[PDB]
């Protein structure tokens with residue numbers, strides 16, 4: 556997250572850290588959202604590679620023991636059938652991970668609330684992006700969870716020539732673009748929490764940013780629109 560600030564300890568209890576094994580060590584690669592005690596929602600491009608993954612819930616400081624973490628393996632990876640690694644702009648950047656065990660819910664670990672199918676947010680709706688991603692373009696990962704106020708940019712405006720043009724589709728959500736705040740590498744797969752009816756719900760899965768950089772004016776962070784995949788999500792969790 557570029558231009559963010561440290562989040563209150565465990566104030567976004569559904570946020571998870573997706574890590575892979577590198578030799579004998581583990582490294583953070585993406586964010587995610589705990590939607591069930593044994594199911595995680597993240598980005599498809601986060602699990603394209605065949606690596607050993609693990610999920611960490613109740614996390615805050617990646618390099619220190621906060622006394623609230625729970626580590627669990629990933630036993631199954633279900634990527635959306637239409638996902639294309641060579642065309643992220645085609646959408647469908649979403650995947651569900653079945654955990655090897657059910658985590659224990661508490662003050663620091665809670666399920667994320669999903670919106671009702673087809674829900675579209677009005678322009679400039681209040682939302683927050685969270686993650687341990689890069690704090691600067693080509694910079695380094697954050698040690699502690701970061702958050703940044705990132706209001707939405709409606710489709711009509713985001714898909715205009717003065718912004719993303721045709722690169723953005725209706726199955727995505729755009730937020731930010733003030734040239735100061737945004738998502739960045741490492742935030743991918745993470746949530747975009749938006750305030751709706753007095754409650755925070757996960758309306759987006761961080762998908763991509765500009766090649767020119769993370770925080771670029773008129774180039775909002777692009778998110779997979781969760782409300783367009785509710786039936787798919789339900790069908791997967793009801794079968795496996």
Ligand SMILES: [Ca+2]
Nearest residue numbers: 616619620621
């Ligand atoms: Ca920690």
